[PDB]
Amino acid sequence: PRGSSMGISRETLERLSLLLFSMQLEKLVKEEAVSVETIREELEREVDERLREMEEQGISRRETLERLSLLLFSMQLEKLVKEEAEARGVSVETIREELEREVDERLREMEEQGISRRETLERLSLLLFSMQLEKLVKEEAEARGVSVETIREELEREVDERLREMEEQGISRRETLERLSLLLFSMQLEKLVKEEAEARGVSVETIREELEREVDERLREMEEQGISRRETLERLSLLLFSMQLEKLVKEEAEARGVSVETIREELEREVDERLRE
């Protein structure tokens, strides 16, 4: 009845998440800074205080991350749906229902439960990651003048090679959300690495090796403090998700011309609905 609590790990997905979240967090702290190290330690202290607060009421770090993700992914899905509705000239509800229809068709083909009978976070993740990945696929296909199928098959090939170069199973035998995250995170990382390489005037390899080194150093420090790789990922996701949420709220408020508190109120109604769930 016990599982990964026995020390048997998704190691590929964990490394990829460390790399991607580290990239995204570095960009966010650089934009927020004052000093970046000051912002980093400030965010660390705020997250630690919030963790103590949720411990004082009996909420674990994993559950805190789960609720924060419900907030963040709700915001990201809302922004993506709104942008697609505007680009297509239809309402947000139409885009939402088309996304649900498409994802449920794919799950049918796979002989799996649909989004309606899945857990709240898993359903939100499936919807959001499907839309993000499809947007990235169509963008890269347009940019390279190739087929969307070509893009998706090259991405699946690259991720499958990476997986099999680590004694792990292929992309064909992973569960739905894990494969979806593997694909999405790989694509997002490649795009971020390439754009930063162009912006800073250095090679892609420079960026990627700096990233790998930053992550290995953080992991060695955590191991020195007696912190597990899973806990390291959870702390990094807490920091990053808080920063992403705050940026999304600020930007949506500035774009709609409303106060930040109105953005939060709308999000909080919608989210407390799924939180009672």
Residue numbers in the entry: -6 to 2, 4 to 27, 32 to 275
Quote the paper.
Motivated by our success in designing and validating the structure of deeply knotted trefoil proteins, we turned to a more complex knotted topology: a ‘pentafoil’ or 51 knot (right), which has not yet been observed in the protein structure database. One construct, based on the kcTRP5b backbone and referred to here as kcTRP5b.1, yielded crystals that diffracted to 2.4 Å resolution. A molecular replacement search with the kcTRP5b.1 model yielded a highly significant solution; subsequent refinement and iterative model building revealed good agreement between the design and crystal structure across the core alpha helices, but divergence in two of the four repeat-repeat loop connections leading to a globally dissimilar topology. Despite the perfect repeat symmetry in sequence, the observed structure is asymmetric, with two repeat connections (R1-R2 and R4-R5) matching the design and two diverging to enable local repeat-repeat packing (R2-R3 and R3-R4). As a result of these topological differences, the observed structure forms a trefoil knot rather than the intended pentafoil knot. All local and non-local residue interactions formed in the design model are also observed somewhere in the crystal structure (allowing for equivalence between repeats); thus, it is tempting to speculate that the designed sequence is in fact compatible with the intended pentafoil topology, but folds to a more kinetically accessible trefoil topology under experimental conditions. The only pentafoil design that could be structurally characterized at high resolution, kcTRP5b.1, misfolded to an alternate topology with significantly lower contact order than the design model. This alternate structure showed striking agreement with the design model in the packing of the inner and outer alpha helices, but the sequence order of the helices in the barrel differed due to changes in the conformation of two of the four inter-repeat connections. Given that the observed structure validates essentially all the local and non-local interactions in the design model (allowing for equivalence between repeats), it may be possible to rescue the design by introducing changes to the sequence that break repeat symmetry and destabilize the misfolded structure.
